Structures are given as structure tokens and as C-alpha cells.
mmCIF file of C-alpha atoms in Angstrom:
data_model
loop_
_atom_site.group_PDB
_atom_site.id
_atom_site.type_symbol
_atom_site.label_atom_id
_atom_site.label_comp_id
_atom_site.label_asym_id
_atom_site.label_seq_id
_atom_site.Cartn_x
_atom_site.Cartn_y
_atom_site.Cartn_z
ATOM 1 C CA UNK U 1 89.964 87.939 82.944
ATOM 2 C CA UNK U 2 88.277 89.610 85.914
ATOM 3 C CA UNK U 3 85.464 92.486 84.350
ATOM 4 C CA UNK U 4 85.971 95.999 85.525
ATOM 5 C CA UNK U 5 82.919 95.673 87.276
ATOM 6 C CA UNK U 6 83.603 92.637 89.078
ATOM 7 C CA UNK U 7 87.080 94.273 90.163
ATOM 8 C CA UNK U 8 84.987 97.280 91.824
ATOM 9 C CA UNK U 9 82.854 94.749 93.505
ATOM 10 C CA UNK U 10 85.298 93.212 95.077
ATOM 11 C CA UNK U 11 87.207 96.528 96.367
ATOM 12 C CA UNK U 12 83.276 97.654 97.802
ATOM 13 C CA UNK U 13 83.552 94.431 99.546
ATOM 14 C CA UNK U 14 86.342 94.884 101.057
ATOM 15 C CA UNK U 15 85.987 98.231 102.233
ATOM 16 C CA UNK U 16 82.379 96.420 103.442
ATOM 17 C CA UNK U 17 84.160 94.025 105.950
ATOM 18 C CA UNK U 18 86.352 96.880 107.015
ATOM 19 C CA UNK U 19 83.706 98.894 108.019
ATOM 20 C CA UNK U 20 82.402 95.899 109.826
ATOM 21 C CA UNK U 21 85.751 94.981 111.545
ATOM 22 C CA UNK U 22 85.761 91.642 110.514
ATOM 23 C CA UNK U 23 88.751 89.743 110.315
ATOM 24 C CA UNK U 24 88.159 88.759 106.564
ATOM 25 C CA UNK U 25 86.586 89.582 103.840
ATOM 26 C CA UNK U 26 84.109 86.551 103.181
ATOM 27 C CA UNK U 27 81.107 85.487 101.352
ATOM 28 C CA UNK U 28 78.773 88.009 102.502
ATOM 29 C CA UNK U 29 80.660 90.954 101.832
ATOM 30 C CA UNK U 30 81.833 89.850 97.967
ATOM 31 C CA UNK U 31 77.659 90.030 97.998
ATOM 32 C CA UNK U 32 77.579 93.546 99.601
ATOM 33 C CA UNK U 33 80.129 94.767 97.581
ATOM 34 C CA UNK U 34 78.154 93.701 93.844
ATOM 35 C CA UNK U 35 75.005 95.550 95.903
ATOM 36 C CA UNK U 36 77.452 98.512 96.548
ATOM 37 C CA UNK U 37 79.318 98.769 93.274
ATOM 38 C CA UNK U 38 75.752 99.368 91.873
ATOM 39 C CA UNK U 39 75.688 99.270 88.145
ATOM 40 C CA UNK U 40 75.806 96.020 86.983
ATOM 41 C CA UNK U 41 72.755 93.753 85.689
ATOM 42 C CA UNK U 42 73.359 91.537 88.572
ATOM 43 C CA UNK U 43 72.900 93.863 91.035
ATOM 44 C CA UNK U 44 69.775 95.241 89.219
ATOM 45 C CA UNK U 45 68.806 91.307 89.756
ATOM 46 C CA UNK U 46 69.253 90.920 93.079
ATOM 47 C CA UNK U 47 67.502 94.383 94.164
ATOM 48 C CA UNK U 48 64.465 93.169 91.390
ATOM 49 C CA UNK U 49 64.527 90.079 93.412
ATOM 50 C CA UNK U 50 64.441 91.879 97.086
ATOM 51 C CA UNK U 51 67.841 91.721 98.134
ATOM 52 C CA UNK U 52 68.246 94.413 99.371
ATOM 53 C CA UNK U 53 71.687 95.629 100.554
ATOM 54 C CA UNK U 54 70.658 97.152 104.018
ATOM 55 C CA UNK U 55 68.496 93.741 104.641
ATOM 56 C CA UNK U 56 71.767 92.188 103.297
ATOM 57 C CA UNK U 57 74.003 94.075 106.006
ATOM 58 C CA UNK U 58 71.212 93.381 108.685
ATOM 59 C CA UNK U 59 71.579 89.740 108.089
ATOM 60 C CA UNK U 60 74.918 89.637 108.147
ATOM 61 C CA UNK U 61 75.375 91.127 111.675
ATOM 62 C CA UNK U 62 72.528 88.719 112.792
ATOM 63 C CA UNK U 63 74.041 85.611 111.200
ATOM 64 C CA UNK U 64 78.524 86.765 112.013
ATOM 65 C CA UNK U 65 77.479 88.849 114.813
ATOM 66 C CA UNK U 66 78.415 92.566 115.817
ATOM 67 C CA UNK U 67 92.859 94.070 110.196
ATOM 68 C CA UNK U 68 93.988 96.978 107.765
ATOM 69 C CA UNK U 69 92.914 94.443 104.659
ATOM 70 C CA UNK U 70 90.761 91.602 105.723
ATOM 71 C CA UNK U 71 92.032 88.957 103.535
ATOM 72 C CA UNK U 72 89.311 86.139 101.785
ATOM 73 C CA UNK U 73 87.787 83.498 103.739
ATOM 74 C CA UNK U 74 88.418 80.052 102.228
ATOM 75 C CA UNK U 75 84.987 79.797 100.979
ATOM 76 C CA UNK U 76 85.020 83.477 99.601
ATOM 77 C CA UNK U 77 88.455 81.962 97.167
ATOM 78 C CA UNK U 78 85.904 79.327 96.902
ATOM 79 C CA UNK U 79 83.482 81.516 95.643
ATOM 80 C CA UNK U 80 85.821 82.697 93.378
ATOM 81 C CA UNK U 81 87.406 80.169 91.524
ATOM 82 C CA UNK U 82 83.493 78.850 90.925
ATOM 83 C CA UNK U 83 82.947 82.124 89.201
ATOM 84 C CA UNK U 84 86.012 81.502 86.607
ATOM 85 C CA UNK U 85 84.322 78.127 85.896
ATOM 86 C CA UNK U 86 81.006 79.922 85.681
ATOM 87 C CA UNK U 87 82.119 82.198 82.724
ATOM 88 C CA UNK U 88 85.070 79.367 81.379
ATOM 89 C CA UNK U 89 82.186 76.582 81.102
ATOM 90 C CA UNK U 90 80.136 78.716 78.733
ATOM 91 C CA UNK U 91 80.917 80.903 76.595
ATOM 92 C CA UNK U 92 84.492 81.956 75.360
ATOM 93 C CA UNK U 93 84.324 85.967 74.614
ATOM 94 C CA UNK U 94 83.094 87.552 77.894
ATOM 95 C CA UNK U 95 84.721 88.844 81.256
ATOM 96 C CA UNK U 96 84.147 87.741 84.602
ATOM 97 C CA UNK U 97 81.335 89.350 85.719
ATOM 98 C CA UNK U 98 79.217 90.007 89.505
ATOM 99 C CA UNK U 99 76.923 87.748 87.970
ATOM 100 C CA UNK U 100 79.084 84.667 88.184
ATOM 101 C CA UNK U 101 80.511 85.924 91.317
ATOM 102 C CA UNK U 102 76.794 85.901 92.438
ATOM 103 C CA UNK U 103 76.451 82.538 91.475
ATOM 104 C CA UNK U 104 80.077 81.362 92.950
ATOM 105 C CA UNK U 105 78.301 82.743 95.997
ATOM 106 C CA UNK U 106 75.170 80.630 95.734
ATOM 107 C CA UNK U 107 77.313 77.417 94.710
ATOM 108 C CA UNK U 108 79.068 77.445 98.153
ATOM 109 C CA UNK U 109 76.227 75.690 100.315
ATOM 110 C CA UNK U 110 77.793 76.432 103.800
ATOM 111 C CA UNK U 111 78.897 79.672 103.292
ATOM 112 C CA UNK U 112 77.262 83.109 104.666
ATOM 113 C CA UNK U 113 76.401 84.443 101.298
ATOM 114 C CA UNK U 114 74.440 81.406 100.329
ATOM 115 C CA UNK U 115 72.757 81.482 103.802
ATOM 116 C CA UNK U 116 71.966 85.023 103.937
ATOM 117 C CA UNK U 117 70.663 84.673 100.028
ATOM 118 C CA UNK U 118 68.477 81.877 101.298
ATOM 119 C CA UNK U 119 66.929 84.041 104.217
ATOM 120 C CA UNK U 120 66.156 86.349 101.530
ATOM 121 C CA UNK U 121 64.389 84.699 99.491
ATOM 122 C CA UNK U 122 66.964 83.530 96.896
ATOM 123 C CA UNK U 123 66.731 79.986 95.323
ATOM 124 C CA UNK U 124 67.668 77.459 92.557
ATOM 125 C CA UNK U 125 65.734 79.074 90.207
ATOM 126 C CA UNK U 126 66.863 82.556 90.950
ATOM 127 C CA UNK U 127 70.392 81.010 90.340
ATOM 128 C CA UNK U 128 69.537 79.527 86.927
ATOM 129 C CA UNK U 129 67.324 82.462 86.057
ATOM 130 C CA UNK U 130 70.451 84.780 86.333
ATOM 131 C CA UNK U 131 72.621 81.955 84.687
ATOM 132 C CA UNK U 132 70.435 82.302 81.581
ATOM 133 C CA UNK U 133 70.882 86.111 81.302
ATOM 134 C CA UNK U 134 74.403 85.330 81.953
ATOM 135 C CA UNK U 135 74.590 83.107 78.936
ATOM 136 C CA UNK U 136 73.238 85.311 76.618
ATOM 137 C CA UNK U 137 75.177 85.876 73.443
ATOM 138 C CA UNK U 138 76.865 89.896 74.057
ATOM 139 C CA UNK U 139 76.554 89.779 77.897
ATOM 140 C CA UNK U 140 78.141 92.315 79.483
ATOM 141 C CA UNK U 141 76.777 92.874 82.849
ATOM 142 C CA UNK U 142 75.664 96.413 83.101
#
């Protein structure tokens, strides 16, 4: 059950590797589009934390370099499917949020969005700091 917000993210990140004519939509634009969509906790989180979208885009095009709808890479599905474990191996009430996408993101090692996360500054902790807000009793992430 995929959260309203985490359905916009997704759309913002696809319009992201659009406008960076990438063949697919991967890891680091599923984390552009949760910076993009703007008004969930998790992207409060990540800007709180100094990830900031345009260092986010400048990273990208340093780390990938410079199709009508750029389908998933097979880590982004990876991504993903992590995030529906995320939210099903917790609690039992909430949506999926950006936050677990977020973490999905971190939990694939090799991908882009972990690497990019990692130039930035992002970390273990960050991860299971967010996971604890995430686990909170009435989470929605707004």
C-alpha cells in the first residue's frame, strides 16, 4: 500500500531522469524525486541532514556522467521491494512512505543512491535514526 506521498516521489523521479536523459530511472533519481516531492518528514530529514537536492543532482552527473519513460534500474526495484519490507517488518497500520524508500535506497550497497548518500555525508546511523522516526506509533510521513 504505496502512501500518496511516496507515489509523488516516485513520478518527481521520473520526470528527474527525464530531464537528465538517462535511460532509466534508478537509485539516484527515486532520491531526487523524495527531495523534489518536498513535503514529507523524510525529505525534511535529509535537507536537516545536508542533502541537499542540487548537491544531490551535482553528484549524480559526477558519479553517471552528463526514452519517453525511463523504466527502473534493477537495483531501483531493488530499492523498492526493501521499502515494502521496511514498513511490512514493523508495524501493521501505516503506508509506504519516502522514508522507507530512503532507506530501500541506503540498503542497496552498490547502488548510486547509496553512493551519492555516502558522499554526502549519510551513514548507518542516519539510516537507523530515520528508522526510529519511522517506527513511531501514528507515523505518517509529512
Amino acid at each position: 500500500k504505496w502512501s500518496w506521498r511516496a507515489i509523488k516521489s516516485f513520478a518527481m523521479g521520473e520526470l528527474e531522469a527525464r530531464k537528465l536523459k538517462y535511460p532509466n530511472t534508478g537509485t539516484e533519481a527515486l532520491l531526487m524525486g523524495i527531495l523534489i516531492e518536498g513535503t514529507s518528514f523524510t525529505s525534511k530529514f535529509l535537507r536537516a541532514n545536508k542533502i541537499m537536492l542540487y548537491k544531490v543532482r551535482e553528484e549524480t552527473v559526477k558519479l553517471l556522467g552528463k526514452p519517453e519513460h525511463p523504466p527502473l534500474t534493477e537495483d531501483a526495484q531493488r530499492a523498492l521491494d526493501s521499502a515494502l519490507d521496511q514498513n511490512l517488518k514493523a508495524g501493521g497500520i501505516g503506508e509506504v512512505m519516502p522514508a522507507h524508500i530512503l532507506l530501500g535506497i541506503w540498503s542497496e550497497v552498490e547502488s548510486p543512491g547509496h553512493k551519492i548518500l555516502a558522499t554526502l555525508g549519510f551513514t548507518d546511523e542516519k539510516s537507523k535514526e530515520l528508522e526510529s522516526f519511522a517506527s513511531e506509533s501514528g507515523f505518517l510521513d509529512e
